[PDB]
């Protein structure tokens, strides 16, 4: 996470793994996910997701939810060409928010910019929407 950036804690990772193994994708996983990922970058969120062993169909459904929210972001935030006024930076695409096409450095650049574009919080919300569909 960013608290400065720090690598995701391995024991916080392992706590998350434990939560999924025991609760699968029952309703109790969503609060735990939420609690365990505070200040997370998209990279960190993906590490969390990519540590889920198996649960293939649950993960496919999640990936599909993320793609829908990413496409919706793009439809409402089209990638208009610059130039930008001073100090301003370029807005993320949906695939940038999901961590697919943005580097950790670019995510930190958004998250610590003034005003910030909280790509970590935006993506975490997409993930939570996906988890709510899975628990059903």
């Amino acid at each position: 996470p960013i608290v400065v950036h720090q690598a995701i804690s391995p024991r916080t990772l392992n706590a998350w793994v434990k939560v999924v193994e025991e609760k699968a994708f029952s309703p109790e996983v969503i609060p735990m996910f939420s609690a365990l990922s505070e200040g997370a970058t998209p990279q960190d969120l993906n590490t969390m997701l990519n540590t889920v062993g198996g649960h293939q169909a649950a993960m496919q459904m999640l990936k599909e939810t993320i793609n829908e929210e990413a496409a919706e972001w793009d439809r409402t935030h089209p990638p208009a060409m610059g130039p930008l006024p001073p100090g301003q930076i370029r807005e993320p695409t949906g695939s940038d928010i999901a961590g697919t096409t943005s580097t950790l450095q670019e995510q930190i650049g958004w998250m610590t910019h003034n005003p910030p574009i909280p790509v970590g919080e935006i993506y975490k919300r997409w993930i939570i929407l996906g988890l709510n569909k899975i628990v059903r």
């Binding site: 089209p78 208009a80 060409m81 130039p83």
Partner: protein, 164 residues
């Protein structure tokens, strides 16, 4: 000799006047050639009929999206995007003609005309020309812009081409 291009600008279909540009082919020949050819329509498409979709008074006038009146669209004569040729020339003042982009090596057809010095864009946008005549016409366009860029009337390239 460096090529020269003109735009004839219209406001809701009424002529406003002519702007002409020298294109710095001596220093940015690939970028200059893209703009020259889109100005003449000789590849079968180009700037004729396209709008200035974003005008910010005291900053710049942006256009060249010949697909829509917005900041998403256009292609170069080389393909959808091309590389940043070089950043030799700077955004020194009013009249500078420079390539719009969405980040590195994403140049297409869109460009902008500075109406001030924009030093913060140096090394980020490829400068490839400069207004010769009709800087008064560029200034007159600003009346139809806003701080956010939206135009209150339709500002079009009613005609364009090469003079020399």
């Amino acid at each position: 000799v460096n090529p020269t291009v003109f735009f004839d600008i219209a406001v809701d279909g009424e002529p406003l006047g002519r702007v002409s540009f020298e294109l710095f082919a001596d220093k940015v020949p690939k970028t200059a050639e893209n703009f020259r050819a889109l100005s003449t329509g000789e590849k079968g498409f180009g700037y004729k009929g396209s709008c200035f979709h974003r005008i910010i008074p005291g900053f710049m006038c942006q256009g060249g999206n010949f697909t829509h009146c917005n900041g998403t669209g256009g292609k170069s004569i080389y393909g959808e995007k091309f590389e940043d040729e070089n950043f030799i020339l700077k955004h020194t003042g009013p009249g500078i003609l420079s390539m719009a982009n969405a980040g590195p090596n994403t140049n297409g057809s869109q460009f902008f005309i500075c109406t001030a010095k924009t030093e913060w864009l140096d090394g980020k946008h490829v400068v490839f020309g400069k207004v010769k005549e009709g800087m008064n016409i560029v200034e007159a366009m600003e009346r139809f812009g806003s701080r956010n860029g939206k135009t209150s009337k339709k500002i079009t390239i009613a005609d364009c081409g090469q003079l020399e």
